[PDB]
Amino acid sequence: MMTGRQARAPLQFLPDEARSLPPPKLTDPRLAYIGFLGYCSGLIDNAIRRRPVLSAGLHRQFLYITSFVFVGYYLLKRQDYMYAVRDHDMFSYIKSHPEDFPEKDKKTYREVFEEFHPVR
Amino acid sequence: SWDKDVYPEPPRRTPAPSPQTSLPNPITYLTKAFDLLVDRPVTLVREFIERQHAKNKYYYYHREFRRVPDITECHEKDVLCMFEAEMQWKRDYKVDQEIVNIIQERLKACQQREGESHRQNCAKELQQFTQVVKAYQDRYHDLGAHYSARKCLAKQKQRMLAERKATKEAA
Numbered sequence: 245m246m247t248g249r250q251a252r253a254p255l256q257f258l259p260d261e262a263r264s265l266p267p268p269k270l271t272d273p274r275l276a277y278i279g280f281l282g283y284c285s286g287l288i289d290n291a292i293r294r295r296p297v298l299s300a301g302l303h304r305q306f307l308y309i310t311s312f313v314f315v316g317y318y319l320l321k322r323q324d325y326m327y328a329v330r331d332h333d334m335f336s337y338i339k340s341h342p343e344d345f346p347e348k349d350k351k352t353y354r355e356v357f358e359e360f361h362p363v364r
Numbered sequence: 365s366w367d368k369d370v371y372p373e374p375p376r377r378t379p380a381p382s383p384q385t386s387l388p389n390p391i392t393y394l395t396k397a398f399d400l401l402v403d404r405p406v407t408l409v410r411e412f413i414e415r416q417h418a419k420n421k422y423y424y425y426h427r428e429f430r431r432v433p434d435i436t437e438c439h440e441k442d443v444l445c446m447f448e449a450e451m452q453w454k455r456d457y458k459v460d461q462e463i464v465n466i467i468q469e470r471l472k473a474c475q476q477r478e479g480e481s482h483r484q485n486c487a488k489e490l491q492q493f494t495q496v497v498k499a500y501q502d503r504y505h506d507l508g509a510h511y512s513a514r515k516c517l518a519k520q521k522q523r524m525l526a527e528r529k530a531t532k533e534a535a
Contacts, residue, residue, distance in 0.1 A: 350442075358517075
């Protein structure tokens with residue numbers, strides 16, 4: 245779909261145009277949910293190896309949460325960039341082709357006619 | 365107390381009591397006993413409660429809604445103006461329902477009050493009830509559980525087209 249956009253500068257996670265965008269906050273709800281995913285994976289890792297789930301290996305669970313937060317932050321940056329590119333291309337194409345996107349003649353309800361179907 | 369113009373009531377005309385017989389009616393003695401034993405303590409208690417209520421006074425107000433443009437001057441698929449028009453129409457729908465309730469209460473009060481001669485003396489209340497019911501039926505009936513201002517506008521437009529065709533074919 246957007247390979248022509250991602251064809252002149254290939255294999256780039258975040259192009260230089262992405263730095264003009266606001267970065268996600270560290271209190272992002274998606275980032276917090278990804279950290280919760282990391283915590284859940286740490287608890288499952290404790291559970292499948294017959295360790296005490298909430299007590300054994302706090303360093304392991306901390307590294308799980310940290311790794312999930314890191315990877316999720318970069319994925320969120322890429323996602324926001326790509327939706328920004330989508331909107332930018334959409335608006336540029338709308339503005340460049342005014343013949344195909346005419347202004348709809350809006351009419352008030354005193355002129356329009358709607359059939360009435362009684363419920364009896 | 366209420367407003368005696370919205371809820372009218374004719375003046376009370378009671379006859380004078382004429383004791384033709386010499387036997388004492390127990391109703392007068394029971395009324396004396398009721399005023400001595402029941403009316404006086406209840407009146408005193410209400411006086412004390414009203415004195416307690418008069419020490420501090422605070423007021424509550426009736427909410428006033430200013431008129432916004434209706435659905436006839438709203439552009440199609442314009443959610444802001446249509447939202448305001450729909451809210452106004454729903455409020456007027458509720459008020460019209462309670463107006464019909466007021467007229468129905470008037471009719472029932474007339475029928476009970478006039479006694480056996482109710483068919484002659486409640487002609488005006490019956491006429492008011494018939495007129496207001498015809499207006500309510502022409503305004504709000506047969507809309508369904510999903511009624512809205514657009515449905516009412518469509519119904520009124522269809523009725524106006526029918527009236528215009530009827531006056532064209534009768535001309």
